[PDB]
Design a protein around this ligand. Structure first.
Ligand SMILES: C[C@@H](NC(=O)c1cc(-c2nnc([C@](C)(N)Cc3ccccc3)o2)cc(N(C)S(C)(=O)=O)c1)c1ccc(F)cc1
Length: 379
């Protein structure tokens, strides 16, 4: 109920659907920049040269504590890519832990489709593990540096509040950010924050696919990805089931593909006609699982208003992936997510800020009995 971590509450902001960021201060004298919180990568990188979409950037020549590592780095993602120069400098998070560490920093000099116009963030904080760090696993990620240089507990939690703000509690958990109990799923392997999905339901109806399909290749949690991305076969089956459940009103095929938007008169969106989606995750005890349930308010995302008009346009935010399942903002916005690195697990709880209506709410429920969950993982 109380809050020793109060100063970290509400330390995240966003330009409505374009990325959640936290202020980070680098160098000496202080150079503060808006940094995207990204659990799907492991590099700390900041724009360090003028760019059309950047309001400000890191100026190495002005930082007396900057150290050039004399090595370049190239980082390609599913969406976007950037190139920079590696170095190290002092880094602090004003509304985060009360510490200052020397971390690796990639100065972004060139990029393609990475920065987003009007997003207001100028860098990215890769919170995942060294295994996926570029150029290789020897480039210590920011959080690894934080834990090794300070006494800050090896854990952080995220509360992303969509339609924009949120909280990134570093070193602990704040009880005002969630209701109900926290349910944990094992971090299968320490590279991306990999998890295992054991069952999927649409309005209580089992998609009935071999659970291996749900994690085909892998299933990860990524705060830097907008959608709930699913492997091709799973995506197709999910869409067919969602379409059937929302038969009250028909939509063009492109809508389900994200190629067409559908808009409703201001405040008339019939959320009730769309089904809830449940993802069952492996639990911490043998044959035990739990489920997280999201509402259409999470998977149907608003598209930057034309200019404060009377038309609420939405995009179906569940899409296909060829690299496994990605639990992006669509999933995270309905919950308070605890990245308990110390205990190699991720916790989910109903968010105190998730968007819902007067009839339904996002939920985290358990326990359930699920056999052979170990076979669901790809090898
Ligand atoms: C910021 C922005 N992200 C994207 O717009 C986006 C990133 C990646 C995406 N791929 N890989 C990533 C990394 C590892 N997160 C790195 C990264 C961060 C920012 C920008 C690009 C890349 O994200 C993939 C997609 N898709 C293909 S999608 C449409 O979601 O299916 C979209 C975002 C994040 C949270 C949020 F609430 C709203 C908007």
């Amino acid at each position: 109920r109380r809050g020793s971590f109060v100063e970290m509450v509400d330390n995240l902001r966003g330009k409505s659907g374009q990325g959640y960021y936290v202020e980070m201060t680098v160098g000496s004298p202080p150079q503060t920049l808006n940094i995207l919180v990204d659990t799907g990568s492991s590099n700390f990188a900041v724009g360090a040269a003028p760019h059309p979409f950047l309001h400000r950037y890191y100026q190495r020549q002005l930082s007396s504590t900057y150290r050039d590592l004399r090595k370049g780095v190239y980082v390609p993602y599913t969406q976007g890519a950037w190139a920079g120069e590696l170095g190290t400098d002092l880094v602090s998070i004003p509304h985060g832990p009360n510490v200052t560490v020397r971390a690796n920093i990639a100065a972004i000099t060139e990029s393609d489709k990475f920065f987003i116009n009007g997003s207001n963030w100028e860098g990215i904080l890769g919170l995942a593990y060294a295994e996926i760090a570029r150029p290789d696993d020897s480039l210590e990620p920011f959080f690894d540096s934080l834990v090794k240089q300070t006494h800050v507990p090896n854990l952080f939690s995220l509360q992303l509040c969509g339609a924009v703000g949120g909280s990134m509690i570093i070193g602990g958990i704040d009880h005002s950010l969630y209701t109900g109990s926290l349910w944990y799923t094992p971090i299968r392997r320490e590279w991306y924050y990999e998890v295992i999905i054991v069952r999927v339901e649409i309005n209580g109806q089992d998609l009935k696919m071999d659970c291996k399909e749900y994690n085909y290749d892998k299933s990860i949690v990524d705060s830097g990805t907008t959608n709930l991305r699913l492997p091709k076969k799973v995506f197709e089956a999910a869409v067919k089931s969602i379409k059937a459940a929302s038969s009250t009103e028909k939509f063009p095929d492109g809508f389900w593909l994200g190629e067409q938007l559908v808009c409703w008169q201001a405040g008339t969106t019939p959320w009730n006609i769309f089904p809830v989606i449940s993802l069952y995750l492996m639990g911490e005890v043998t044959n035990q699982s739990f489920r997280i349930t999201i509402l259409p308010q999470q998977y149907l995302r608003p598209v930057e208003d034309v200019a404060t008009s009377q038309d609420d346009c939405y995009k179906f935010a569940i899409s296909q992936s060829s690299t496994g399942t990605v639990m992006g903002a669509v999933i995270m916005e309905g919950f308070y997510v605890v990245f308990d690195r110390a205990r190699k697990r991720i916790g989910f709880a109903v968010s105190a800020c998730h968007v819902h209506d007067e009839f339904r709410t996002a939920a985290v429920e358990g326990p359930f009995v699920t056999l052979d969950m170990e076979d669901c993982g790809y090898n």
